[PDB]
Design a binder for this molecule. Structure first.
Ligand code: TOD
Ligand code: TOD
Ligand code: ZN
Ligand code: ZN
Ligand code: ZN
Ligand code: ZN
Ligand code: ZN
Ligand code: ZN
Lengths: 511, 509, 516, 51
């Protein structure tokens, strides 16, 4: 579809990088028990010191180079300590007079590295690469990582190393890894590279400003993604949305200059289908709040292009699923995409709107726009006849007060599905915590005039109340809801996390 | 050029008063040594008293024996407290009824910019409640040639009353007794000109935004250029698209009024040893955009004032076009638009591209002025000029820094700063030099764009904004005059027309 | 020496002060570059730029008296690295004696004349190389051009950031300061005099820093005045500490009111330096000494208030005592300096003073309080009256007075106001030679009228947001016929990113006292 | 909400919550937020500056 413009200088497409420099990195994995070669490039040792906090650095791996072995002797390395994230690296000549760099990154004093601990270690490495022109990086693991954490290492290393320069006006070509039981970890390499891009792809969609990434352009990019993967795709426009009676979703976009666009991708196995899964993502390309304008101190309106992160997470999953091509599965990737704006055409606080299942809804706050669109997406999803419906959304800012910026919350009406997601959180290493849908709060959504209230008046515990709302639009299917509002944006790094991509993919692949 | 309407009752032009009662006033100046006579009207003596608390009044000269009213014994009952005044009506030698009085000028001998203003308001108060046909002013204090002009300019401006938007008298003669009168005579018509330039700017600023919009304002500029005789060119959206002024165009996207870039040009008949570009912020209304001005103190009802820079620029054009200076080339520029809330508006977070290729990440749609000024400065530099001076109501922080009396000037070249300061002294529109601290530039380092529009932090709002603008001047001496604090007179609920005299004194020297 | 009052026995009774710092144990040696550089033990770092070429290649240009190290540092090898400001790299190699040495560089950009901020950025990079490394010796080679002041500034700043305050740590501490510092620079003999001058300025600055960082339960009016006495004793400075009874006698109603709500009696600090020479100029330095600014009944409860930071409201006093150390150490000639501070605590109590209260200063002026959070100018008012009775040529006060400084000049430049252009211009000149940036701001007389009180002689505050200027207008009323300047350091005192004090003002005030 | 350093104790809390009919939910102690309590001068901060 043609993207409308106000002026000719308004962008008509989202720029997307498919071939990243990361895709150019040949990765080799060696076994540590055989010793390390330090010929070319930069060599980093990942070291800890169990039971001695900020303890001295001690490398314990034989290196087949006399010049670098003298450097790595204990007398010399004790001049450094293993405080988590700390780093030092030196440039030197090896035995054949070639310029090499050797160093370390501290991995603390705790045997067991967490999802967070590994992230700080990776950032320390990345800081050296953004200052490095060399062609090869070699990483020596003198720490314990399972197969999953090692993949997480690569994913995170890949994700942070890559830099987005689309709106701006010496990457390594080889990655060496020394790890124990090397042959078991080799299978994780190419799986990581896929998970990498899915996350970075979502990241690009989220990071794209709202003048670039709008309902039309995002839906167009989704089609383009579908065409490159081969997935069945369908974009529902206003006229069809009107005949599906999706009044909640349609009301939300009334004030936008951009027509509502509903994204529906499909992966179908060549196998026979033993699981139908629908994934639902919040797709608000910009959340101004509408007539409930985000004007309060803390509203973070400069950040609100991010409000389509859920949708982005779903497309990120689509790349991974379409690439890894799992068997025996049928996956529907859904998003009711629109923009929440202020206009004469905007919907009002107090407006009563009718969802596609016949339920009348009284709007109390137009900034609670996400649950209204999700309501129609969930009705759309359940009529598809699926086994699992999983929605993921930057729904409530309250998550910042409950779980914070690292853990997302999961709600649901079915314990098994919730359990599968938690398991997916545990193998993808995107942390999720199970939060309750407290039925006692359901009465706070009882409207005097409509079938149900959009929000409560009362009950701060908005994240649960929003889930109580959503539960009303799934009639007889196992359903789960993940609020990624607190975890979607990396406030420290001023960039998206691409959160959810690996979580959802692990959910479809391991089920 | 045609102003769009929502309803037919919407104004399609800015009403402008060109011929004011001030232009009708007969002025003559005499030397105090010859004595004063008190024929018609009201005669006012400006007196001070070094060693006052404030102390008693003493007159000194009057060729009519009434010399007795102004005798030392009667006048000692009144004091010279700066701004204090009393006037009495009497019969003179010719048995005609005349009014006589004083205005206290304190004890500090050389009166300042602010104090002389207080004298004028006191003088104007008597004129506003009296049906005089002539006013005679006696200066028993000592003033410069420049301050006397300032007296006249301020007198004219405060005396004039704007009644354009009302539904529901002036003297014809002005006498001044001062010593070395022959030296002050050249200052009179210069003052009346500065008066109208200032008052003209006042008229544009005070004009509400439904009257004063991007189209109606650009039309007035043409009308000004035509009467004056100034070359003019008005850029519409299609030529702004051309020119790729994406920063300026984004700001106006949400408006029902098409963006209009105003370009007036003065060229001297002399030979040109200086080419100057004057650039003004021309936001006819600053709603703030999606960062709506809803916080306490935003003063959104005043935001028609956000084109004061533009108004000052046209006001300067009047003085320049009338006084016709030598060896100077002047460009009068303003990128005019309106910052509104709409489905079509630019959003917080949007990345836009200025005309020099620099990409800008919008962090606050209310930081709209620097976006429009960015493209104006690029355009200004393309004219190939020696000096660029921009003037803008950019930042409210100025109220916290210098307050409501002194404006701040920033710049990249000390000489240009020096000329502006010198102009401030002779124009008597107070300005103070503030630094552009490069140490703060890093707060504009964007994660995605070439540069951030704002800092996220660094409350040095005026300095950060100056840092933003400086990125759009590559190789030209440039100074930035921030009038966000001095433009509006809150007590009198009217504009000051600040900058018109400052900019004019700058081109003249 | 007075007794510090306690509420419970666990309340600290003195401010912990580190006098003998690891910096003082560092032997500093200066060599000329023409004799060549020896590449030792420890870490040897080159400060390199590339004039007119942005992020340009690295080139070492100083003879290294080692064939192996010259070969490593030959530019064939060095141009893979760039001189981008703040950039650094570490080198490992063996020298001619088959010994392992460490070498590296810090990029100094392409601008030739480094500003104070740039040099700080240079220094910060140097400190990273010093941290987490257990060096015994650090060597710095200057392949850039710096004047004597900037070179001294290098040392002062280096020492400052290198040092770590661990006074309030108990269960947290880990790894080791260098014992030797080598400097290679051209015309070294001209720079040698700056070394010990830097070491003094460093500590005066760090000493001020220690007092400011000290929390309000540690650093209170009594304990701070005690530290000032103890400092005077180590430096042989004349001191006198005025307690409540003397302040009552002197009728300091403005200063005394501010402290009414505190459990700590008010303490006025008066240190004095006198040269054995003949005195040809007398200077009074006044520092704001509010050990904690709660705001009083105008409690700091609004969101931007920074109430946990308000132990820093005695930064003015700290700079002044820091100056006393430097002056007391360098012993200038023909000078008499008074180091003054009206110290108190602004608290909420049954005994607190109220908004609206009218108080009488020591010069007879009655003051109507409009905001109890504008407490600083009240203490400075009585301090300034006290200062002028001493019969001095200059009165310079320094204070964290107005938050508006953050909106005007920001966190890097301090503001100076004054009644005398020659004094303002000596202070600004001192800013240049001390490299503590200060900008001259105006005292606007048009604003004086808003201080016109209906009942008292003068208002404490206006009702006109130009706070720094209004505060200066207030203060000007308490200096009748003496040259006076006011340095507002509210914006520059605390380093928010680093999360520490700067000790701002020590070098500025010290340079001011020395160069006349 | 219940927080803890030991799963056996937490579950006992949950079990008692079930039989006392006083509802309690298990919330995580997230170590990644621990660094926000790193004080510049004291051993530890009382509060964060991570809402
Ligand atoms: C939004 C920009 C910062 C500009 C803005 C401004 O200064 N806004 C602030 C406010 O009044 O809330 C403010 C004032 C003083 C100090 C700090 C912040 C100015 O009014 C404008 O909109 N110019 O176009
Ligand atoms: C208010 C006072 C006359 C001086 C005071 C100040 O300037 N406060 C700030 C201001 O007025 O801009 C501020 C007030 C409220 C909320 C945020 C910031 C300064 O902090 C102090 O108390 N000095 O002693
Ligand atoms: Zn919302
Ligand atoms: Zn939303
Ligand atoms: Zn604005
Ligand atoms: Zn504006
Ligand atoms: Zn205060
Ligand atoms: Zn204070």
């Amino acid at each position: 579809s043609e993207v409308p413009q106000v002026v000719s200088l308004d962008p008509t497409s989202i720029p997307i990088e498919y071939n990243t420099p990361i895709h150019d990195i040949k990765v080799q994995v060696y076994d540590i028990k055989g010793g390390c070669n330090v010929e070319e490039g930069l060599t980093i040792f990942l070291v800890n010191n169990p039971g001695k906090e900020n303890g001295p650095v001690k490398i314990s791996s034989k290196v087949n180079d006399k010049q670098v072995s003298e450097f790595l002797k204990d007398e010399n390395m004790e001049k450094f300590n293993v405080k988590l994230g700390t780093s030092k690296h030196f440039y030197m000549f090896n035995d054949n007079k070639n310029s090499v760099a050797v160093g370390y990154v501290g991995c603390g004093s705790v045997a067991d590295l967490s999802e967070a601990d590994m992230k700080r270690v990776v950032l320390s490495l990345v800081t050296m690469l953004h200052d490095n022109k060399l062609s090869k990086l070699t990483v020596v693991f003198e720490i314990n990582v399972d197969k999953n954490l090692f993949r997480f290492f690569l994913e995170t290393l890949f994700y942070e190393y890559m830099t987005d320069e689309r709106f701006k006006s010496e990457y390594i070509k080889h990655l060496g890894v020394y790890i124990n039981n090397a042959d078991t970890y080799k299978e994780e390499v190419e799986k990581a590279r896929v998970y990498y891009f899915g996350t970075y792809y979502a990241s690009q969609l989220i990071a794209a400003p709202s003048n670039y990434c709008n309902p039309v352009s995002l839906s167009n990019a989704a089609v383009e993604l579908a065409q490159k993967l081969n997935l069945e795709y369908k974009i529902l426009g206003v006229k069809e949305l009107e005949e599906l009676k999706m009044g909640a979703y349609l009301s939300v976009g009334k004030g936008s200059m951009y027509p509502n666009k509903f994204i529906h991708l499909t992966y179908k196995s060549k196998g026979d289908v033993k699981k139908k899964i629908a994934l639902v993502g919040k797709g608000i390309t910009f959340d101004s709040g509408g007539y409930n304008l985000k004007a309060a101190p803390g509203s973070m309106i400069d950040l609100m292009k991010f409000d389509m992160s859920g949708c982005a997470a779903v497309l990120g999953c689509a790349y991974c699923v379409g690439t890894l091509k799992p068997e025996n599965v049928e996956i529907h990737f859904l998003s009711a995409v629109c923009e929440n704006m202020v206009s004469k055409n905007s919907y009002r606080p107090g407006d009563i709107i009718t969802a596609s299942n016949g339920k009348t809804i009284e709007v109390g706050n137009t900034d609670a726009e996400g649950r209204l669109t999700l309501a129609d997406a969930l009705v759309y999803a359940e009529k598809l006849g699926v086994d699992y419906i999983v929605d993921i959304a930057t729904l409530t800012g309250a998550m910042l007060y409950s779980l914070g910026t690292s853990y997302a919350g999961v709600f649901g009406n079915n314990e098994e599905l919730i359990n599968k997601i938690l398991q997916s959180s545990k193998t993808s290493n995107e942390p999720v915590w199970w939060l309750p849908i407290i039925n006692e709060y359901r009465a706070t959504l009882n409207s005097k005039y409509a079938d149900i209230n959009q929000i409560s008046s009362s009950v701060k515990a908005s994240s649960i109340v929003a889930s109580l709302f959503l539960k009303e639009f799934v009639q007889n299917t196992a359903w789960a809801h993940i609020d990624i509002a607190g975890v979607s944006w990396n406030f420290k790094a001023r960039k998206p996390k691409g959160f959810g991509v690996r979580l959802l993919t692990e959910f479809v692949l391991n089920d």
